[PDB]
DNA sequence: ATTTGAGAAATTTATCACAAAA
DNA sequence: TTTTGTGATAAATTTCTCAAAT
């Protein structure tokens, strides 16, 4: 499966949830492409990699395709997350997941600063000492670790998660993590610098 | 300019700053590829698009190439940013830029909630009423707007920024913004769902 | 002795076109 | 009356060679 497909699959997934909220039961690839700003052929091709969910001369059943993509994306289950780093980013993600997301459940947040190791970072979430990270991940079968520590300590924390059996890592620190589990990176500063690149190109 | 180049250029830029902090004056493309986990040929190709910064049989002057990429990225200037939305994401980005970044200066943050209007979101940064957004952007020549409002209000905020002369937008809301200025998106939930995709694929 | 950079090839991704179903 | 889905084309991206500098 081509690399850019997974990203577009997530976009189709959110769009289908919107159509369900609107009451739409059937949608064509051209109607989907019209509101995502993509070519209908690309949408049909990407879905081709995983199966035949369409009805020739009719379209796609919104609920069936939504459920199908959800199964492919692994979203049909609840994912247990831990946040390492109770700073700006760590608390922002903790307060959001507990509130807005129902498929991702943050059950722990960790820090190394004695001032924060006792404070509450989100509703029903008390900051734990990072010394307990491995024990917590193994005991509660945590599956996703979000790294929100400075770059100088991201790799070390990444290896502890992988050692404790983490299945994947969401990395916010501006460094390339080296581990055997999947890693998605969110580099805010890199995005700004990609933005300035495009800005000066237009000028 | 191929699409993936700008992203890798930002990666070379951070790596070169690290080499400067280490005292390295000259570096080969193979040494750069060694610390970025890329092929040396790719690094040389990407640099080819913008000029000839290397010394045949020698390598690249670290400081000269750093300055060259910095000029291409548009980082040799100070960029004025405003944050719309003083929530979790908005406050996290405000406190970081004011503290950690020297090339991006957040000079304003805006919200529509009377409870937060007037409050301080970061050192020396007081939340302003979003009704003043356009006026602020025009007067102070703000160049980059960071959108940290719920998805239902992202497009409307994007159009006000573009109307006030904003040059680019960093978008955190899970929706595709439609404007004539460049837009870089950071979709945290989409990243998690791309991560779950990779997790269930491997296993 | 090395190491960059300019074609050329190889690889990957997007787009098209149309028969096949409903 | 139409729209999905498969092959094939087309386009974009990555990788490879190696002459030319040093
Ligand atoms: N906040 C932003 O907008 C932003 C922007 C760009 C990049 N980043 C990057 O995201 C990451 C976190 O950003 P932030 O704003 O939250 O910084 P922050 O200083 O507010 O929070 C970092 C937290 O990590 C803790 N920490 C440090 N070492 C630790 C360790 N071994 N174990 C456990 N905890 C540890 C610290 O106690 C601190 O609380 C950083 O790598 C940063 O470079 C953030
Ligand atoms: N916090 C996360 O980790 C996370 C994760 C996924 C997605 N997001 C998305 O990022 C965006 C912001 O996230 P958040 O956690 O900070 O939400 P938040 O509730 O913590 O803060 C959002 C702020 O936007 C303000 N607002 C609403 N409408 C406004 C308007 N017209 N003008 C000005 N201000 C307005 C609100 O007063 C609020 O303070 C959202 O779109 C969210 O879906 C965030």
Author numbering:
A (entry chain B), B (entry chain A): 5 to 207
Sentences from the paper on this structure:
The transcriptional repressor Rex plays important roles in regulating the expression of respiratory genes by sensing the reduction–oxidation (redox) state according to the intracellular NAD+/NADH balance. Rex monitors the redox state according to the intracellular NAD+/NADH ratio and controls the Rex regulon involved in various pathways, including cellular respiration, fermentation, oxidative stress response, and biofilm formation. Structural studies of Rex family proteins have shown that Rex exists as a homodimer with N-terminal winged helix-turn-helix motifs and C-terminal NAD(H) binding motifs. The Tma Rex was composed of two distinct domains, an N-terminal DNA binding domain (residues 1–77) and a C-terminal dimerization domain (residues 84–208), which was linked by a flexible bending loop (residues 78–83).
In the present paper, we determine the crystal structure of Tma Rex dimer in complex with an operator DNA and two NAD+ molecules. The crystal structure of the ternary complex form was determined at 2.40 Å resolution and refined with crystallographic Rwork and Rfree values of 19.53% and 25.09%, respectively. The asymmetric unit contained a dimeric Rex protein bound to one molecule of NAD+ per monomer and a 22-bp DNA of TM0201 operator region (5’-ATTTGAGAAATTTATCACAAAA-3’). The N-terminal domain of Rex, including the helix-turn-helix motif, formed extensive contacts with the DNA in addition to DNA sequence specificity through electrostatic interactions and hydrogen bonds. The DNA recognition helix, α3 (residues 43–54), mainly contributed to the interaction with the major groove of DNA by hydrogen bonds. The α1 helix, α2 helix, and a strictly conserved glycine-rich winged region (residues 55–65) also supported various interactions with the DNA molecule. Residues Arg48 and Lys49 of Tma Rex were key residues for recognition of the major groove of the DNA. The NE and NH2 atoms of Arg48 played a role as hydrogen bond donors and interacted tightly with the N7 and O6 atom of Gua5, respectively. The ADP moiety of NAD+ was buried in a hydrophobic pocket (residues Val88, Val134, Leu137, Val153, Pro154, and Ile161) and bound by hydrogen bonds with residues Asn92, Ile93, Asp115, and Lys120. As a result, the distance between the central residue, Arg48, of DNA recognition helices in the ternary complex structure was 36.3 Å, which was smaller than 38.5 Å in the NAD+-bound form.
